[PDB]
Each structure stands twice: as C-alpha cells, then as structure tokens.
Amino acid sequence: GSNQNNF
Ligand SMILES: [Zn+2]
C-alpha cells in the first residue's frame, strides 16, 4: 500500500 505522513 502507499503511505503519507502530514506533520
Ligand atoms: Zn505498501
């Protein structure tokens, strides 16, 4: 799967 981190 794809992963995204938005701090
Ligand atoms: Zn993955």
Side-chain angles (χ1 to χ4, degrees):
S2 290
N3 306 90
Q4 188 190 57
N5 294 291
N6 306 297
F7 291 90

